[PDB]
Design a protein around this ligand. Structure first.
Ligand code: SF4
Ligand code: F3S
Length: 106
């Protein structure tokens, strides 16, 4: 499974959903997650993220290991997203800022 980590929060560019063959992205107010059972590890989405926030599960940085479980849980509760939309308004002020997990909205 590929996993969306911290830099997506408060950016949520959604360029990633164009390239997914199985539509396994689920949408939250200011974050996206990848459904771990659905993703066929095609890796097509992780060049496409502007925030470079997608990683192969096995390549998630040590300080972002929380996101693996997080993607798995919120994929169960958030609605599926299949079309690209506009980036959140202030997306590039937040692009690159660390520790945005405290801003996550459910
Ligand atoms: S690795 Fe492929 S199947 Fe998984 S979320 Fe990305 S585009 Fe979809
Ligand atoms: S910032 Fe998020 S919405 Fe997609 S294009 Fe990157 S994982």
């Amino acid at each position: 499974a590929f996993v969306v980590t911290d830099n997506c929060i408060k950016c949520k560019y959604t360029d990633c959903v164009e390239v997914c063959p199985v539509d396994c992205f689920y949408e939250g107010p200011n974050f996206l997650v990848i459904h771990p059972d659905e993703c066929n590890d095609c890796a097509l989405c992780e060049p496409e993220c502007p925030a470079q926030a997608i990683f192969s599960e096995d390549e998630v940085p040590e300080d972002m290991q929380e996101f693996i479980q997080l993607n798995a849980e919120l994929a169960e509760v958030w609605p599926n997203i299949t079309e690209k939309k506009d980036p959140l308004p202030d997306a590039e002020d937040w692009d690159g800022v660390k520790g945005k997990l405290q801003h996550l909205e459910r």
